[model samples]
Target: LPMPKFGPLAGLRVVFSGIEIAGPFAGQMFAEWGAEVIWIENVAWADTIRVQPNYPQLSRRNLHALSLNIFKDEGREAFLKLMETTDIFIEASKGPAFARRGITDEVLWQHNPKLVIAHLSGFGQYGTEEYTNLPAYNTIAQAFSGYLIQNGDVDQPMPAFPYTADYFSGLTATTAALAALHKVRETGKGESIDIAMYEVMLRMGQYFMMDYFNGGEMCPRMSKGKDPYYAGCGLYKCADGYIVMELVGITQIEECFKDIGLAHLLGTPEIPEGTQLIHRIECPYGPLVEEKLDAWLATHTIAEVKERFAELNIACAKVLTVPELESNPQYVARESITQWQTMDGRTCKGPNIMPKFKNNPGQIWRGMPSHGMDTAAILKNIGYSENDIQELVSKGLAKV
Candidate 1:
């Protein structure tokens, strides 16, 4: 079947090339949202997503693939010709990879001046000479950006898993590219975006940065998931499972203490009326309240705690596991877990398209394209004759 055309970005054209998660993930977003996206791969090497098993599969749906050796002058000429029809171009690599191959933004502008080019890299295009070309993975980016230090215990810094940094970089690139696309619509000029994965992680940790910069406060690393200064906010173990309970304001704690049979302590010297107003670090009653709340929570099951908390209008949520999430009432109600057919015709269950749009919803039009599967069709649309495609493929300059 032909690629379906429908979404907010319907007529937009995107061409992207990258390995692993960051750049290709951004292209996936475009493809899912109905932008005509072509995912370019190297003629020789396949991307990790192509080789890996059972992870990040849904991301490749609705994308067309073309494999070419852009390192060659002939291949570069063909790429430039394709760029003339592209509205956005995305690439992920080391700092100077593309420019060194003569595929710079300035050269592309000569073909399509309105192209929005987003470059995803480790340390950005221009940085310390030593770090600019250094390769980075998700863990490296998290560690370098001070994000890892904030996680784990004080002595053991832990990096986030499942490619968090790469995913964040993808989202960051998508947002910047769309903003640039808007500007291009108004001013008729393209934009060049330099997205450093580490920089994106740093930006994500700005809450700590703001405190350090303005108040001379550096948040100390603690156990994995604890609020350093809060009194009634932490993960608590119930009889059956775990739940996160948060009691931020005076009214919240007043109501909570009452439910836990501590109402008489509200105005006493042990737990004064204004005690909860102070930050936990200075509040004398903070530890006492937490101790009491903890002991009370240990007696109830997750469902009981959740139900009671809802009645009390308290903030709490059961720490759900993968199995629990798949069968969750809310998830089932919203149809969050979706099943789609793979290119191999096997049914694969994964997340559905997010941020539902009323008028122009995104879709899973097709499964991931095989490497160079659409090469001939794509080449023909770009003015390449049948003989030209055959010659390029036979000469190892392109793949089909």
Candidate 2:
């Protein structure tokens, strides 16, 4: 198949120096968008983590892959040489330790002043706390950012799961990197992007921040599904599975009730005519509504309920499981999920490129690489001697 159009950033050279989850994810986004990405891994020292197991067999596999171990003098020298030509460098190491070890953004800018340097971390580069040396991960960031408290039940606090912070931070880094690349392309000046996972998660909760600032108060943990502003806005179990029904207006409520054959029972005079009064009601036939809705929904298949909702022009959707989502027609038609085969002979699929662009659509070229798979080739291109490269590999100073 033809490579998907990615406009502008096509063929840009990007280097990912560390094998952390966030760094590779960001690199993957760029690689899918037509950048020639080189992912450097320290095979002798570390292995892949956070990436799905079966990543090597993906459809878009044309990333200019490489790796390097910076421990050895020869390897470090080789990496610096490569940095001279790399257009963008992404790293996830904490603090300026990488710079102290000779792979700093300042050093790269000295070689190529127009190179974009992206740093991914838990806190950031400049903080007053010395805990910057302490290793921080997704959970730590989520806890520190107050994301875990606001998302769960009001009664019990719980950490946000599935690495939401890491994913969002990766996306933020990609956005910043792209914007910086655009600026550099136009003005011949590279930029430094510092990404703090904690800060990103907190900023993502801006609406909550505004609510707190305006005295709306921080909701208790596990406090979802009780908002009265939406009469039908919650998960309801159906015969086959479940569906989420959300009716925004009282007019829509009438339509929904009529569609569900519950119109005859909506005789209460207190129930307002619009959505505004709907929020004021303490309980709109609370338990009775649930009992009736449960009974009605249990009689229909998920498909039938969705079709009925669509016919009424009310907002609704089936609560799909992961497998259902992957195989569902809606997902496939929208291209919301993408499948790839890894080098290890396993096949996997995950959410695809988002915010589809009509002119410059994004595409995934390859899954992440095995640790240090590209170390030798990357070192050679940087003018490392054959003997030196082999010696570094033998000493576990570099790997491929």
Candidate 3:
């Protein structure tokens, strides 16, 4: 038998409608945490993940997939029936799109009061007249939020890769949904959350923004793999591979140089005993110290360097590529990597449930279903007979 849903939110139900990463990812998190999550896709336009099996396989596990054109009278009624029992409803669209379609939070509450409704969008539900309706994805949100301006090296600004804004917005919405869910349970009233993706990205860069606001200091773009302000605190190429080291404080710097057989450089004309080694990169002896450190790292392998650094109590980590991650000892020990069977019975490998819980741990009961794979079953749950389901399918109101 398949593993049963087991987590902190096992008893709750979630109905989520989203096209791509920012919105759907929140529902996926709830599913992974053992909520009975139903993913509603439009009958006409399939989610972009349908074209990428890996995305669905990795992120959309343990979900009941349903395709329905809620614009239709019959379809909207069926969706309302589902909402009567739903504890959380999340969707992604332009400002008031759902409201314009007559599926507002108040309407959903008419079916089930205490429903936590979350709307995820690029700009927000209410913004400037020109920007409220503008379309956006991850890169667009990053650029609009000023996050892209602070990233990349001196050469040029770069978009945060692999849907950073999308993922962050999803996580932000998930957190907001949970908080609102708590309030709903307490007061027995529904709640609505407006999650703007660009706003989420803005929160991420708040620390840098404060500097600009108060001191008129705009944080510079990062130096290529190095910490521009500090020595012994950047990426370095070891004999076998690359390692990032973060040895801070005067004592740690002195100890590192002493251990590495460079004790003589500690108290020199350019380098004094009490000089801040962190600011060494800005001084005349910056190149000299960097060159010496680079030569030392080039001679030692990652293993040797790690072992020695561990003794000094410095923070260090070796960078692992994607292929190496699959077999890495740490990943194996924690079972961070996992494999699951897809709907078509093909084996797919990817990450497992993160931040594992000890008592009520979650399980992967099933993989991502084909589009509308559970439409018939879900319709039956909402009081539809086989004939009604067939009629809806024939009328293009539902797909199964």
Candidate 4:
């Protein structure tokens, strides 16, 4: 008998049927892990902002170059044909319009019963708000999810500047796709994964929701003194910069004072003994502590502060800039970052492989593909004739 062949997700074929950020990120991850990933973009319907100059670096880096006009009859038919052979279909689009366009779960299951289809949107498939078909972006999701509330003040609301929803949504899509794939492999069954960014952000903000629902208190933006569980829990401006310190209990407070050689200051009769150190120290004691700390911290560098804190088993870290992070010894020693050479002859670095696999480690082969560079080749492999591909290109049904 032949030796059993082995590859994680081996023989899996994935088709990414959208031009958005999340779908491509998922497709790239699957492709890097040995799946035959095909990106089906709509060239005729392509958004110019995606590939245009002056677009954000991250946007330009992730979006596909080639677009596929799925609205075209030929494009839809070609996509369905491709789906028949694909093990998984990943997409990021609103509502059920894409499904109605012959790429629905029913249509795909009708062709291949074992296919895993993952759909991503702001609102899910069946919701009253889903019909509104409003264009949902990352900032909107962040605001709706209460993430923005926990980030800033009440008088002036600030949206979470970064694309937190997009990133989390991508991760959710990947996890759902993997789960569905595992089920297909084990039970010979198919699954349709519907991921809503709004819902995901809401789930991520569960702690805030818990306080609002059960505690009967509106969740405020994060600030010092928000939690009664810890004393000295605030961002303190040091000689060099700033650091967040928290003493969870009286013992930790004593240890902190002892470590800083300020144990004698704690015994002063002017300050009364109490569990609420913030209250006791708010007046003159707070400024006195700040003054002493300023002097002590000024004498030592950031590294010295971290070193001393480590010896005392106190949690502390220097505020590291982007360049500092790159040069940090711990990050390099742990292999937290790795480099990938792109198709455009540029090398980019990113976080290392996550959720480390014990048996079969996945690898990142390339950064991302140039627009439609694999279009002709992929079409040929999928049984499309040279003439068929050329005809599709001529009619703008596909792009390379």
Candidate 5:
């Protein structure tokens, strides 16, 4: 695709390091929005995500990768030079590592007065007292913040087997970076952002937190009881697979009964009696309703169930796997997933830039480079001579 030369964030520069997931992912979001995000990375102890088995699951577009080992003397010096010329600086290193290598946010403004240094980590860099030195990942944050308890069936809690904590934190950082960058442009001064992933995930557990605060104890888990907040809020097995549908109202329940040819069950004393505002009572009818729904759904395919659910105006969606999303009509209609071609002639798919805008929209300009494919060219633009570039490579400070 031909990227617009003047996309929303066209002229802004973004410099990021510590390529596990969040930082690089944030940079990817910025790049998709037409920002120049130069991802400083290396083959030496390469970014953690690159070592993951599903590394290909991630896409890099409109983002540049530089294989410079900032641990090396030459690498550090070179980065300092680059920092002096960039607009935003995102560092994901741990606290000790950051300080040991002189990666302080306090001094990032000498090169560019309007610089926005966004520091992302598992914990806020300098905030409320906690073990900032401990290594943390998605699980650590989820467990520590009590968010893990919310996942799984019944009381047998299983870890949320996804990158929710990290990605949400990255999303938060992306928003902060943009706000900071905008402010810098207006005021001709820079700012700092210290975000903790734990906080981000914990913030989402407001209701759970309320329970704990009320009793000074862990929140009680909702057991497999009652008809799951009315018969409409649970998943049911269709003829071919599963579909989630929510009736949430007697009116919706009436429609579901007529469609399933089970109108007699609607007046049964087992089910709940009201819509959202009318009832503060639990429905003792959940299991029986589920039993009936399951049998009724088995007679129809997911397509039929989906169509009928819409006819009733009940909230509904077909449960889908990640791969299924690409073929799903809802996802397809919105053009959510897009395909990108990598340097290896392999095709990778990722979601298109989210929450599309009407005018001056953003898009991925290019895929990731093959280990500093643009090293020589990038160096040239930064005023490094051919000899200097080769010397750094020879010293093991950089790779191509």
Candidate 6:
């Protein structure tokens, strides 16, 4: 069966060369939303994601890949020819290289006046810093954005396990691109977007800067768990793993005791002491609840814990790992973790389209391509003869 094309962005195409995490992921979004996306790279400098298994699948799906050098005249000529058919060009590279080649917004607009250009880097494109052209990774953005300072334990700060900054910037770029695309649809004009990963992360820190400015306090470092605040209602040890329990208000606390078969704890002095569990607690019975709950949880299996909690309607769940999540019922039934056959024919999984739209739903059908897999196909598309393609590859300008 052929993969269906949802044409929300039909009849339009995006060109991405020398792209990476943030920029190409935006292109992947465009591809998913029904645009023709072409992912090209200078064969001399491969997209680093190619060697990184799994991550590349999320960014390279449903696109044409061409392996050709940008500097080679023949290859550049072919690339220019391809750009003549494009509506957008997204790149993640330093400014000096951009200036050296004179591939400015004006230059691209000249090739095709209705093009959206997204310039993504760790810093903004127009920074006045001495290191303005020093290309930085998402980790650099993490460090610069104060996310690292506030993440992890007070003893030692660590970057978040997931690449939050990169993905968030990609989402931002996608939004900007769509807005620009809509403008082009209306006015036949182009847009230039400057996205800095560091600034992107900075803007995402919820109330980090503003709340501090108002209250004169920095955001505290996050801990593994905030136990005391929950007032004998934090995560407790199960027979096999850990289970989180939220005990808010006096009624909820008493209900928890009743459900966990610790009803004797109620009404006794210091054991919740007759509906005394309340917010920001200075309650004496909290320790009693914690001690009893810990012992009860230590003896009960996770399933047993859940079964009892279900009766009380307490919101709780065992900490789930990646493998555990892969087997989650909802994750499978909704096709969240979808099956993707790579271009090399390896069976694997990738994320499905998120926030499904009723009339124009997105899809995940295309395979991740191997290096230079579509080189000849791209050459043929641009009216290059077989001999011309052969000569281009022979001169080390193109790959197939």
Worst 10 residues of 3 by lDDT: 275-284
State in Å the error of residue 95, model 5: 3.5
> Measured by TM-score, how close is model 5 to the native structure?
0.84
What are the per-model numbers of colliding residue pairs? 0, 16, 0, 8, 3, 0
Worst lDDT run of 10 residues, candidate 1, spans: 274-283
Alpha-carbon runs more than 4 Å astray in model 4: 1-10, 45-67, 129-132, 153-155, 224-230, 246-253, 257-301, 349-352, 355-359
lDDT tens readout by residue for model 5, 1-400: 1245746878777888876777777777777778877877774655656655445345466777788876568787787778777888887755444765676656566666678888787776765455775665888788877788876667587567677787777888898988988898788889988877788888876664776778755444444422323454656677898777766666777777566656665555653344331121345545555667768888999888778777777777777787678888878899888776766677877778776867988765576666666667666778889999989999988877
| Each prediction's TM-score versus the true structure | 0.95, 0.82, 0.92, 0.80, 0.84, 0.81
Please give, for residues 235-319, the per-residue lDDT of candidate 3 as tens digits.
8899998899986766767887776677887877766777645554356766666777789889999999889888877789998
Worst 10 residues of 2 by lDDT: 272-281
Q: Residue pairs in steric clash, candidate 6?
A: none
Q: How accurate is candidate 5 locally (lDDT)?
A: 0.71
What tens-digit string does per-residue lDDT give for candidate 1 at 2-98? 5667889898899998978889888889887889999998887777787777665687888888998776867888888999999999999998778
Task: Write the residue-wise lDDT of candidate 2 on 1-400 in tens digits.
Answer: 1244464467577887655457677876677667777866664455345254344334225454554565467666677677788888888877555765766667778788998898888878778666565565888888888887776655776777777787788888888988898899899998988787888988886654677879776544423544433346677777877678866655666776665666764546645445332332355564455556667888888888888778766678877677678778878799888776555566666667666767877766555556666666767766777898888778667766
| RMSD after CA superposition, every candidate | 2.0, 4.0, 2.7, 5.2, 3.8, 4.5
> Top model by TM-score, which number?
1
Clashing pairs in model 3? none
- Residue 205 in model 2: shift from native, Å? 1.7
Each prediction's Cα lDDT score? 0.84, 0.69, 0.84, 0.65, 0.71, 0.75
Residue pairs in candidate 5 whose N, alpha carbon or C atoms collide under 3 angstroms: 227-286, 232-246, 232-247
Over 4 Å off, model 2: 1-8, 50-52, 55-65, 100-103, 222-230, 257-301, 332-341, 344-368
Cα lDDT tens digits, model 6, 201-320, are: 887764656777687666555334435345555556788987787765566678777755778767766554656444334555555666667787888899997887787666688877
